[PDB]
């Protein structure tokens, strides 16, 4: 009786949600028609023997969600929880938040409310969205505000797609990213940033995919998202509730962006040991967000294992990693790790690019190095904002120029928060 509602906003959130629910189904033996022929901890994510995902898909245009209600999982979700408008936010935060958002926010809240009615102990939300899209950025912050008013005591986790120029579709994505981050900063309890370039490089290097597509990326993303939710979906021992992510990973409310590192990513081979995959957690080439944690300091570090993992091997791997690597923590934090083993084996999509592994690990850490991702975004915002390039598209929608300064000042404050947390004595 501790249900979680997944909310997928815009194209990226919807397509990532497809990959995530596809993997949840394989890991829980649920067929595309909702039937499972085979612990009832999966009931936190799935409600005449049919199992319907506790999810809501929202997009301001229908082409993406139309593929969902037409594809292999057309009978998995109820038609009511797939919400689409007629006109998208045209890569503009102001359209998604103000112009087109206003028209369907009540309908989306009503559909979310129907899933909340089916809950005897709602824990909170998992919101999947892009930073750069008009809907992903504008509609999500609008929705996050409402969710705080209507469901005050509930937790709100994010899985945010950070922009990469290799797969970027709009020049104004840095504007949308800063605008959304500023406005949803007070309404998110923990947010897992997924840099599209970090994922793209893992597909190119570890999977040998010459030019990765959203399919290649989303399957990798889903694999990491699944590791983070395995604790909530199965009867695990670490991260058993949404409130446990704030307890374990976020020490201060504004510093709520943990870095996720996953290992092993192997192309579809002798099995990699516990020590080998634990060492990969400290290599920056395996992270969700491109940054260097070796330059910054840690305030929280969780190792989430899956499959054949013996606690004896985990402790020996951690013992060697401290004596061979420099893993500095902030003065006010104990240098240590919260370990969790989820006996459920790592599951991959049968035809996918990832290989089946006997054991896998996902390290969730709160490092000050993640501020590098903010700095890169803030720089691109500054280059354009100094000339007011594209700002007329936002102002024309009813937004004020002052909202940009407000959001950017909050970003400088956030970068300065990461700086303060990191000094000594």
């Amino acid at each position: 009786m501790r249900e979680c509602i997944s909310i997928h906003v815009g194209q990226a959130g919807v397509q990532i949600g497809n990959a995530c629910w596809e993997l949840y189904c394989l890991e829980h033996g649920i067929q595309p028609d909702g039937q499972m022929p085979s612990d009832d901890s999966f009931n936190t994510f799935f409600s005449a023997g049919k199992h319907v995902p506790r999810a809501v898909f929202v997009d301001l245009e229908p082409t993406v969600i139309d593929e969902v209600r037409t594809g292999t999982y057309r009978q998995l979700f109820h038609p009511e929880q797939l919400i689409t408008g007629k006109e998208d936010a045209a890569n503009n935060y102001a359209r998604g938040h103000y112009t087109i958002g206003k028209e369907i926010i009540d309908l989306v809240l009503d559909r979310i409310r129907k899933l909340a009615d089916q809950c005897t102990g709602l824990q909170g939300f998992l919101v999947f969205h892009s930073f750069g899209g008009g809907t992903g950025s504008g509609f999500t912050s609008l929705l996050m505000e409402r969710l705080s008013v209507d469901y005050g005591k509930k937790s709100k986790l994010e899985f945010s797609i950070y922009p990469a120029p290799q797969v970027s579709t709009a020049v104004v994505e840095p504007y949308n990213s800063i605008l959304t981050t500023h406005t949803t900063l007070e309404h998110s309890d923990c947010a897992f940033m997924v840099d599209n370039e970090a994922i793209y490089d893992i597909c190119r290097r570890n999977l040998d995919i010459e030019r990765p597509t959203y399919t290649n990326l989303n399957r990798l993303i889903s694999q990491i998202v699944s590791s983070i939710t395995a604790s909530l979906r199965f009867d695990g021992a670490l991260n058993v509730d949404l409130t446990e992510f704030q307890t374990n990973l976020v020490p201060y409310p504004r510093i709520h962006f943990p870095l996720a590192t996953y290992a092993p990513v192997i192309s579809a081979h002798e099995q990699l040991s516990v020590a080998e995959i634990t060492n990969a957690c400290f290599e920056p080439a395996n992270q969700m967000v491109k940054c260097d944690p070796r330059h910054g300091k840690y305030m929280a570090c969780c190792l989430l294992y899956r499959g054949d993992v013996v606690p004896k091997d985990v402790n020996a791997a951690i013992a060697t990693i401290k004596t061979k690597r420099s893993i500095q923590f902030v003065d006010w934090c104990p240098t240590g790790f919260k370990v969790g083993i989820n006996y459920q084996p790592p599951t991959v999509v049968p035809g996918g690019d990832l290989a089946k592994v006997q054991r896998a690990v996902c390290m969730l850490s709160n490092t000050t190095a993640i501020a590098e991702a903010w700095a890169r975004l803030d720089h691109k915002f500054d280059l354009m904002y100094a000339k007011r390039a594209f700002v007329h598209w936002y102002v024309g929608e009813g937004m004020e120029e002052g909202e940009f300064s407000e959001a950017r000042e909050d970003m400088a404050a956030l970068e300065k928060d990461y700086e303060e947390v990191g000094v000594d004595s």
Binding site: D331, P334, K338, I341
Partner: protein
């Protein structure tokens, strides 16, 4: 060798514990920001303000286009004066 293992939980499909290598050096809780409730009435007030700003923008554009129409009628009347 200075490793302290604190067994946290043991469940049906899981097992958790903490591994303390070293305690914090700063013996206290520091001050950096340390942090209230947004209202629906306040949200709707900002959303309505933007809605009216957008409406004013379209009204200004329409006023400008309608002045072109008044001008066009003046042009048509001016031709009439000649022949």
């Amino acid at each position: 060798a200075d490793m302290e293992v604190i067994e946290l939980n043991k469940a049906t499909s899981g097992q958790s514990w903490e591994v303390i290598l070293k305690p914090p050096s700063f013996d206290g809780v520091p001050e950096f920001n340390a942090s209230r409730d947004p209202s629906l009435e306040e949200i709707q007030k900002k959303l309505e303000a933007a809605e009216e700003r957008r409406k004013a923008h379209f009204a200004a554009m329409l006023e400008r286009l309608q002045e072109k129409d008044k001008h066009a009628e003046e042009v048509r009347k001016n031709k009439e004066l000649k022949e």
